[PDB]
Design a binder for these strands. Structure first.
Ligand code: 5JL
Ligand code: ZN
Length: 271
DNA sequence: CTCTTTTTTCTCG
DNA sequence: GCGAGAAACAAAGA
């Protein structure tokens, strides 16, 4: 998932599990708890969920007075809220059991991670990850964004994917944002003129906020949180190889950029 | 059978 | 420091 999908999961968890006492925690894949599963089980059993936050693509469970469980879903992580008798599924790894259901974390590729840290370690934790600003008008300052672009010879798509200019874009939304802003993904950022940077800045905010509003992009679903999204019906380029661009009618092309599949309109996004 | 495809962090030169 | 490539892992498609 990308930021909009994580925000959608965050919102459903906030509505459904805040106030719930963790009755027990179990793992079939304890090694994905980077701070130690047995330690986490000892610390969090019996505590109540107070809130769910997010920073970039990271989910943050606020548990008890002092605990923060930082969860990253990476490529394929999925949470679901299940009955206590729900059958095990093959790629389920962890579960937090409440009195009237359980929150199960599943992840085919096993990339996702859990880290238990304290409240006052959250801000230093994200500083150490070098996460950039949230993609909002209030936090995403165009002036710094522009100065960083002007200094760099990096290509715009890999630089945006670093999470350092702005947090939350992944392969789907960076391709959508670049199409919307009419920027070729291989453009060196120091070649972007001010008006292109302005359009890019606004487009990042607008695309991600639209995606949040539509509940993220779910291709297929299953019973998982976040699976009722509608943003996939709005994608203009991602996964549209060979289809016609909706602005100019040229076929969308797919290339590889810094090892990522990359979809763009060659007319609208001039090299 | 092989090769390729689908977020973060590392090695290597 | 950089970029290229690959690793972590599993599955599906050519
Ligand atoms: O954290 C990241 N750092 C880099 S350098 N590239 C990249 N691409 C995605 S998606 N996430 C990240
Ligand atoms: Zn076009």
């Amino acid at each position: 998932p990308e930021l909009p999908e994580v925000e959608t999961v965050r919102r459903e968890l906030e509505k459904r599990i805040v106030g719930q006492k963790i009755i027990s925690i179990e793992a079939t894949y304890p090694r994905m708890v980077l701070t130690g599963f047995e330690q986490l089980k000892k610390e969090l059993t019996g505590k109540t969920i107070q809130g769910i936050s997010r920073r970039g693509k990271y989910l943050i469970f606020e548990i008890g007075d002092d605990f923060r469980l930082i969860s990253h879903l990476r490529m394929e992580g999925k949470y679901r809220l299940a009955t206590l008798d729900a059958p095990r599924e093959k790629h389920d790894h962890l579960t937090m059991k409440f009195a009237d259901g359980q929150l199960i974390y599943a992840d085919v590729r096993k990339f996702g991670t859990w880290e238990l840290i304290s409240t006052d370690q959250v801000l230093p934790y994200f500083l150490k990850k070098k996460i950039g600003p949230e993609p909002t008008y209030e936090d995403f300052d165009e002036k710094l964004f522009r100065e960083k672009l002007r200094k760099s010879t990096k290509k715009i798509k890999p630089y945006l994917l670093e999470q350092t200019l702005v947090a939350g874009l992944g392969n789907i939304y960076v391709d959508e944002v670049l199409w919307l802003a009419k920027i070729h993904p291989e453009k060196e950022t120091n070649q972007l003129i001010e008006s292109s940077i302005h359009l890019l800045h606004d487009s990042i905010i607008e695309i991600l906020q639209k995606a949040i509003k539509l509940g993220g992009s779910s291709i297929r679903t299953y019973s998982a949180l976040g699976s009722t999204g509608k943003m996939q019906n709005e994608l203009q380029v991602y996964g549209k190889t060979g289809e016609k661009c909706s602005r100019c009618g040229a076929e969308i092309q797919k290339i590889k950029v810094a090892g990522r599949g990359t979809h763009f309109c060659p007319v609208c996004q001039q090299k």
